[PDB]
Design a protein around this nucleic acid. Structure first.
Ligand SMILES: [Mg+2]
Ligand SMILES: [Mg+2]
Ligand SMILES: [Mg+2]
Ligand SMILES: [Mg+2]
Ligand SMILES: [Mg+2]
Ligand SMILES: [Mg+2]
Ligand SMILES: [Mg+2]
Ligand SMILES: [Mg+2]
Ligand SMILES: [Mg+2]
Ligand SMILES: [Mg+2]
Ligand SMILES: [Mg+2]
Ligand SMILES: [Mg+2]
Ligand SMILES: [Mg+2]
Ligand SMILES: [Mg+2]
Ligand SMILES: [Mg+2]
Ligand SMILES: [Mg+2]
Ligand SMILES: [Mg+2]
Ligand SMILES: [Mg+2]
Ligand SMILES: [Mg+2]
Ligand SMILES: [Mg+2]
Ligand SMILES: [Mg+2]
Ligand SMILES: [Mg+2]
Ligand SMILES: [Mg+2]
Ligand SMILES: [Mg+2]
Ligand SMILES: [Mg+2]
Ligand SMILES: [Mg+2]
Ligand SMILES: [Mg+2]
Ligand SMILES: [Mg+2]
Ligand SMILES: [Mg+2]
Ligand SMILES: [Mg+2]
Ligand SMILES: [Mg+2]
Ligand SMILES: [Mg+2]
Ligand SMILES: [Mg+2]
Ligand SMILES: [Mg+2]
Ligand SMILES: [Mg+2]
Ligand SMILES: [Mg+2]
Ligand SMILES: [Mg+2]
Ligand SMILES: [Mg+2]
Ligand SMILES: [Mg+2]
Ligand SMILES: [Mg+2]
Ligand SMILES: [Mg+2]
Ligand SMILES: [Mg+2]
Ligand SMILES: [Mg+2]
Ligand SMILES: [Mg+2]
Ligand SMILES: [Mg+2]
Ligand SMILES: [Mg+2]
Ligand SMILES: [Mg+2]
Ligand SMILES: [Mg+2]
Ligand SMILES: [Mg+2]
Ligand SMILES: [Mg+2]
Ligand SMILES: [Mg+2]
Ligand SMILES: [Mg+2]
Ligand SMILES: [Mg+2]
Ligand SMILES: [Mg+2]
Ligand SMILES: [Mg+2]
Ligand SMILES: [Mg+2]
Ligand SMILES: [Mg+2]
Ligand SMILES: [Mg+2]
Ligand SMILES: [Mg+2]
Ligand SMILES: [Mg+2]
Ligand SMILES: [Mg+2]
Ligand SMILES: [Mg+2]
Ligand SMILES: [Mg+2]
Ligand SMILES: [Mg+2]
Ligand SMILES: [Mg+2]
Ligand SMILES: [Mg+2]
Ligand SMILES: [Mg+2]
Ligand SMILES: [Mg+2]
Ligand SMILES: [Mg+2]
Ligand SMILES: [Mg+2]
Ligand SMILES: [Mg+2]
Ligand SMILES: [Mg+2]
Ligand SMILES: [Mg+2]
Ligand SMILES: [Mg+2]
Ligand SMILES: [Mg+2]
Ligand SMILES: [Mg+2]
Ligand SMILES: [Mg+2]
Ligand SMILES: [Mg+2]
Ligand SMILES: [Mg+2]
Ligand SMILES: [Mg+2]
Ligand SMILES: [Mg+2]
Ligand SMILES: [Mg+2]
Ligand SMILES: [Mg+2]
Ligand SMILES: [Mg+2]
Ligand SMILES: [Mg+2]
Ligand SMILES: [Mg+2]
Ligand SMILES: [Mg+2]
Ligand SMILES: [Mg+2]
Ligand SMILES: [Mg+2]
Ligand SMILES: [Mg+2]
Ligand SMILES: [Mg+2]
Ligand SMILES: [Mg+2]
Lengths: 46, 93, 271
RNA sequence: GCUCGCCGGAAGACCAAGGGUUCCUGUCCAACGUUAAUCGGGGCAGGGUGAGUCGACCCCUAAGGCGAGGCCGAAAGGCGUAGUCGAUGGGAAACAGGUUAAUAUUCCUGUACUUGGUGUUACUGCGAAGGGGGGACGGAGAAGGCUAUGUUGGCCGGGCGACGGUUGUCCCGGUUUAAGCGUGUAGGCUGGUUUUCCAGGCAAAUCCGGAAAAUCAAGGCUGAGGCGUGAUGACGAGGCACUACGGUGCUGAAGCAACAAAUGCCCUGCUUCCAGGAAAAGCCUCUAAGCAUCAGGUAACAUCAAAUCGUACCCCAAACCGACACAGGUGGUCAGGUAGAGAAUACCAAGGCGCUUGAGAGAACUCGGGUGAAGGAACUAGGCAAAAUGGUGCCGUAACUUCGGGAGAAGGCACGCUGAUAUGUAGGUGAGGUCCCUCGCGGAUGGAGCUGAAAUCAGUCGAAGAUACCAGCUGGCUGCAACUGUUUAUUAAAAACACAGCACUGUGCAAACACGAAAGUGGACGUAUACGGUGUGACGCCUGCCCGGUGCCGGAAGGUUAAUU
RNA sequence: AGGACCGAACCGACUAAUGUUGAAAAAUUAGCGGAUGACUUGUGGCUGGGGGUGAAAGGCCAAUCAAACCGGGAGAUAGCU
């Protein structure tokens, strides 16, 4: 039937993209945590 | 007016293939690998400068690199730009 | 007028509609229209702050002149019109100087009648005057409460206000609710009742009719679980509680007005 | 390669979203493919996506987001003005043919169109962050005029038949052509034209709105299709020669008419209803400041520019979402024939497939079906399941009723083919011809040709004529809920929820109430015929007694009573 | 005209059988309800956890709901196995 992941690049970006992260201090803390952990991909943008 | 260093940078290599050969025999068109950021005007100016031919139009497409696995390791080739250059039916480079 | 539908279907059996043949049948006056999208009862936080609001038919806002401050320039009524934004009818009037305005249509106002505002206006329906010039005992509507602010009392279909006394700088009004109120004599008022007095005789007839007006279903508190309403819970139909609002305030008889700021203007509560 | 079967409102074709090289060629078969594999959406190498007009980008805005200052908040922050973003909407312009292994409205051929910049020529009041118009808007219904398209005829080319007949009222195939440009037709809307004046459009305006005269009575706007051109071109059945069995080269007939006809177009139209149906720019127009024989505007001509990004391929799926090459899910567009009311259904076309294990055998038992003597609910918790009914036209149809219904009540009759009425009728369409003149996309007459029900009478075949597919079982008594709806995604669809209606109650507007430390916001650009809460639940007849208990409302003489002193 | 009627697409989910280490973590087959509306659907947006939303079933909030998920307090505590 209809599963839960219905992909859409525009919504994916607008909700979890680099600029959406940087828009708020909580998002910037997310980015800091991922950088400290060493993630090869910070966000969904790439 | 595009300066000489720019003109000397934009062109990279001629493209060798059967579609290119057919285009050159049939429509007087050469196929070139150009700089990824080269524009139609720059390619036209460079072809005219460094091949002393005349050009009526340039058609450009960007080729996307092929994802390739090399001994079990993902690797991606580079995107490059390809230009179809039409010459004014008397040039025959 | 008021006409019953014929019972050709269960949804039509009980419909009573109010139809006015005199309403303009065309498009409204384009220069006097804005856009007003719907809220859904949601505030700027995005939360439902008023329940049972949503959907309905698209509407466009007609700028109605509640101030009626073009003094001295007579105007003629061009046409009555249907306003989706209120229960009353709006009349499009044209001033002698080539300006057009929407006003609330009083009772008995037909196309071609003359209206005029100002201190020198005649005492006839549709004319706006200061309430110190309006005689005591007159029936008015579209009453102001602060001079120059615009009419705010008795704007709904069939409503009006009585002027029962003029003592000093204040006039005593009998509001439609039965409340006796004082207001400054400098505020303006239009003479006569608001038209469309048959608006209360309409019967919607079906649930979809109310959904057309943006009203959403109301779930009784006693039909919920206790976690949702103070009335919730039970095995079978149990109440055993004093009736309250969904937020615990007693909802049958407990007064909620608290305005010491305006307590001074109320001569007598509505009772 | 030849047969056979399956889909054909899809299991065909084209997009959007999503994926990303799966596309094409060569090569390999270890692993992957539920088997083999020489094959593959597998491995390896190479190739492939061409745009002024398609889309994005771009100009403009919706919901909503962010938000200089600002207001508010222990901090973090929240809200919001000016602004600035944000399509799923508005805004310039291209078609037909040909070609690759793989792209094409992008390449080539032919024929076009749009916008902007310049430079000459002629004339000239240009100018906005402002005014006005426009853009610009619902549901339903009905009809007329058309086209896409199809059928038949004519025409052209081919054929004369493996088995009785087939030179004919015979068989097969083809009979195509765009944008653009010119014309302005069916239809729709609208009275024009000129003067004078003006508390309006923040100022101004010659523009818009308003007022008063004069005059003319037909002018304008919009508009499918047709016709002409584009087009002596292209395409074209087929024929001739070939590599080399993929396909190449050359040539090329006819290319008309009638009828039927959309859910497409005229049509954002018309009629009607109430629930009363985006915004902004582009565009047109008016002026302000300002410039003023300069700039700028208009027209003609020439010239230049139109960048950048996407373009392969899948796309109801083996490529997307489901862990799988998974009987699931997935928005839009196209829409042939015969029968039919139909986009149902059956068989077919174009097109695409036979579902990635087979070969035998023909036990019990399981699954999905067919038929069944006599009986016919005896089964069972219960007619569960199955069987049955089933179309069109006509006749006929009860209690009850809120007068609509009940009702397709129930029940019954006819139904194929052939001939005649009538070598094809009623109806529809409508040529030639003649007439008329406003002379043409015109009007009158006229009926050729084409198409074509339904009915009656007579005959005739079968067991059976709504022959298949398709397609109500019916009636009686009764509980509950008035009714259409909604619900426990995944054991509960109900008598539960909602509901229109009723009642009580709060609320006088900076409303009550709700979200929020607050500012603010919703209620509502609403104003007591309004809004919130609570109970009941169409409609009919009704709704009795109790204020002691608890709650609420009102009162404030007295008793008790906090901080404070 | 109609929350009118019969009936495809479309939306749903009443019955039965199958399946139940399934073709499928909710389907298939034959029937069934609505089908101009309180309809259905694409795209985008808003509401956030004692909070939302709820024609109300304690339903739904990413196969999770009488209090989501992720990380932390944290090696909570466990007279119990
Ligand atoms: Mg080109
Ligand atoms: Mg507007
Ligand atoms: Mg309410
Ligand atoms: Mg109610
Ligand atoms: Mg309950
Ligand atoms: Mg809640
Ligand atoms: Mg409680
Ligand atoms: Mg009980
Ligand atoms: Mg009790
Ligand atoms: Mg074969
Ligand atoms: Mg078949
Ligand atoms: Mg993509
Ligand atoms: Mg690959
Ligand atoms: Mg392939
Ligand atoms: Mg291969
Ligand atoms: Mg194998
Ligand atoms: Mg082998
Ligand atoms: Mg491969
Ligand atoms: Mg390109
Ligand atoms: Mg375009
Ligand atoms: Mg905004
Ligand atoms: Mg903000
Ligand atoms: Mg700030
Ligand atoms: Mg913008
Ligand atoms: Mg868009
Ligand atoms: Mg567009
Ligand atoms: Mg292709
Ligand atoms: Mg404007
Ligand atoms: Mg629109
Ligand atoms: Mg209309
Ligand atoms: Mg409409
Ligand atoms: Mg035709
Ligand atoms: Mg045609
Ligand atoms: Mg012949
Ligand atoms: Mg023979
Ligand atoms: Mg023929
Ligand atoms: Mg033509
Ligand atoms: Mg005028
Ligand atoms: Mg239709
Ligand atoms: Mg393609
Ligand atoms: Mg397909
Ligand atoms: Mg398979
Ligand atoms: Mg599948
Ligand atoms: Mg068909
Ligand atoms: Mg039939
Ligand atoms: Mg079918
Ligand atoms: Mg075929
Ligand atoms: Mg057997
Ligand atoms: Mg059996
Ligand atoms: Mg049987
Ligand atoms: Mg038997
Ligand atoms: Mg028998
Ligand atoms: Mg019997
Ligand atoms: Mg019996
Ligand atoms: Mg028995
Ligand atoms: Mg028994
Ligand atoms: Mg029994
Ligand atoms: Mg049964
Ligand atoms: Mg059966
Ligand atoms: Mg029958
Ligand atoms: Mg009955
Ligand atoms: Mg019958
Ligand atoms: Mg005839
Ligand atoms: Mg016809
Ligand atoms: Mg009884
Ligand atoms: Mg009983
Ligand atoms: Mg019911
Ligand atoms: Mg129902
Ligand atoms: Mg629902
Ligand atoms: Mg449901
Ligand atoms: Mg369930
Ligand atoms: Mg009443
Ligand atoms: Mg307020
Ligand atoms: Mg009840
Ligand atoms: Mg008492
Ligand atoms: Mg008291
Ligand atoms: Mg219906
Ligand atoms: Mg029904
Ligand atoms: Mg669907
Ligand atoms: Mg169920
Ligand atoms: Mg089914
Ligand atoms: Mg159905
Ligand atoms: Mg139905
Ligand atoms: Mg938490
Ligand atoms: Mg319960
Ligand atoms: Mg999760
Ligand atoms: Mg869940
Ligand atoms: Mg808890
Ligand atoms: Mg601790
Ligand atoms: Mg922890
Ligand atoms: Mg532990
Ligand atoms: Mg113990």
């Amino acid at each position: 039937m209809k599963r839960t992941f219905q992909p859409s690049v525009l919504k994916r970006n607008r909700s979890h993209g680099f600029r959406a992260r940087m828009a708020t201090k909580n998002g910037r803390q997310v980015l800091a945590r991922r950088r400290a952990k060493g993630r090869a991909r910070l966000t969904v943008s790439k | 007016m595009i300066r000489e260093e720019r003109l000397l940078k934009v062109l990279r290599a001629p493209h060798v293939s059967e579609k290119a050969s057919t285009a050159m025999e049939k429509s007087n068109t050469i196929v070139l690998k150009v700089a990824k950021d080269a524009t139609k005007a720059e390619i036209k100016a460079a072809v005219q400068k460094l091949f002393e031919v005349e050009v009526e139009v340039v058609n450009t497409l960007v080729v996307k690199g092929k994802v390739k696995r090399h001994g079990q390791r993902i690797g991606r080739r580079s995107d490059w730009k390809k230009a179809y250059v039409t010459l004014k039916e008397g040039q025959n480079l | 007028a008021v006409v019953k539908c014929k019972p050709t279907s269960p949804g039509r059996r009980h419909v009573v509609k109010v139809v006015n043949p005199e309403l303009h049948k065309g498009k409204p006056f384009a220069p006097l229209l804005e856009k007003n999208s719907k809220s859904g009862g949601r505030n700027n936080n995005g939360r439902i702050t008023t329940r049972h609001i949503g959907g309905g038919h698209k509407q466009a806002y007609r700028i109605v002149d509640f101030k009626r401050n073009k003094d001295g320039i007579p105007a003629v009524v061009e046409r009555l019109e249907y306003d989706p934004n209120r229960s009353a009818n709006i009349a499009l009037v044209l001033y002698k100087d080539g300006e057009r305005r929407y006003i609330l249509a009083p009772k008995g106002l037909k196309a071609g009648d003359q209206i005029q505002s100002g201190v020198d206006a005649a005492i006839k329906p549709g004319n706006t005057l200061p309430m110190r010039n309006i005689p005591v005992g007159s029936t008015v509507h579209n009453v102001e409460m602060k001079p120059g602010k615009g009419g705010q009392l008795a704007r709904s279909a069939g409503t009006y206000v009585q002027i029962v006394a003029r003592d000093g700088a204040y006039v005593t009004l009998r509001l439609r609710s039965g409340e006796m109120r004082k207001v400054e004599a400098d505020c303006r008022a239009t003479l006569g009742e608001v038209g469309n007095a048959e608006h209360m005789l309409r019967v919607l007839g079906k649930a979809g009719a109310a959904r057309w007006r943006g009203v959403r279903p109301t779930v009784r508190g006693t039909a919920m679980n206790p976690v949702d309403h103070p009335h919730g819970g039970g095995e079978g139909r149990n109440f055993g509680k004093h009736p309250v609002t969904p937020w615990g305030v007693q909802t049958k008889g407990k007064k909620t007005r608290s305005n010491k700021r305006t307590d001074k203007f109320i001569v007598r509560r509505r009772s």
